[PDB]
C-alpha cells in the first residue's frame, strides 16, 4: 500500500520442435498494454520425420512478469505494481530422463 515515485521478430515459434502461436493480450489500463503470449500448436512435438510425435508433449513455459496497472482506474501518472503470469514459449517434454 506504499506509493512512491519512479522514473519512466523472433521466429522460434515456427522453427521449434514444439511450435506455438502468439496471442495478443491487450489491456489499455496496463503497461505494457500489448503482451504476446504463446500457445502451443500441437499436443506432441515434431520428430525427425516431421510428424507429430506423441511420445513427447508441447508445454508452455510460463513466467511471472511485473506490470503496471493504472490505479485508480482510468488515471494516468498513477499505477499499482502488479504480478501476472504469461506464456513466453513452448518447449518439448519427454517422460524419460537419462
Amino acid at each position, epitope marked *: 500500500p506504499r506509493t512512491v515515485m519512479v522514473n519512466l521478430s523472433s521466429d522460434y515459434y515456427n522453427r521449434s520442435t514444439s511450435p506455438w502461436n502468439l496471442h495478443r493480450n491487450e489491456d489499455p489500463e496496463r503497461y505494457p498494454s500489448v503482451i504476446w503470449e504463446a*500457445q502451443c500448436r500441437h*499436443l*506432441g512435438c515434431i520428430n525427425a520425420d516431421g510428424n*507429430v*510425435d*506423441y*511420445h*513427447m*508433449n508441447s*508445454v*508452455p513455459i*510460463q513466467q511471472e512478469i511485473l506490470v503496471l496497472r493504472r490505479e485508480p482506474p482510468h488515471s494516468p501518472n498513477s499505477f499499482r505494481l502488479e504480478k501476472i503470469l504469461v*506464456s513466453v514459449g513452448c518447449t518439448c*517434454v*519427454t*517422460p*524419460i530422463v537419462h
Partner: single-chain antibody
Amino acid sequence: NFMLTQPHSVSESPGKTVTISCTRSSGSLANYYVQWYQQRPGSSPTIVIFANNQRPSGVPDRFSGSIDSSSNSASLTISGLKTEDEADYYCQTYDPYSVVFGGGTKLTVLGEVQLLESGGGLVQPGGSLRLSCAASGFGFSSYAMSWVRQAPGKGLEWVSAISGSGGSTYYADSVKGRFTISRDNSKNTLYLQMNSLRAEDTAVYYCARDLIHGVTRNWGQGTLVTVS
C-alpha cells in the same frame, strides 16, 4: 477411440514366468507409450512399467515390458513368480484425445509425490458433487493430471484429464458433457466437477499425475462416490 484387450485371468505356480498381453484395437501401438499398473485387493494401483519398458525405482528387475508392432500389442513379463505378485494388472496407453485402460488381467499365484482425494460420498440420482485433489511434493503446474475411476465389480476406467497449464481438457465418452475438470496451480489442487450423475457413476475416483498426456506415474488414495 480404441480398446485394449487383455486376458481375463492368468494362473501359474510360484517361480515360473508369465506373460500378459494387451492388444490395441485401433491405431499403431508403437506411436503411443504403454504403461503397466499393479492393483492389489483393496489397494491403490501402483505403476510397474511405463514408457513401454522403463522400470521405476523399487520394482524388481524380474518385471519387464515389451511391445510387438506386428500384433499391435504390448506384453508384461513377470519372471520368477511369487505370492506378492498376485494382483490385478492393467495396461494403459493413449491417443491424442483420450486415455484408455485395459480390461485387466487377474494374476493368481497357485498356493515424494503425494495425492489426496476428498469430496466423495452419497448423493441422489441427478445431484451434483465435486472432488478435490491435494497435490504436494512436486511442481504441480508442470504436470498434466487425470481422473481414473473403478466401478464396483469392474476394472479401471479413465474419466478425464487436464494439461499442466489448464488449457487442454479431455473426457471419456461416458462422462463427457456432464463432468468438468479444472485445476488451481496457485493452490496445487485439482478438481473434478460432476453434474447429472447416474447409477453407473458409482466408483472409486483416483487422482493421477501424468509425466505426459496418457502416461500416469502416481496415484492417490481414491474417494468413494455412491449415488442412490
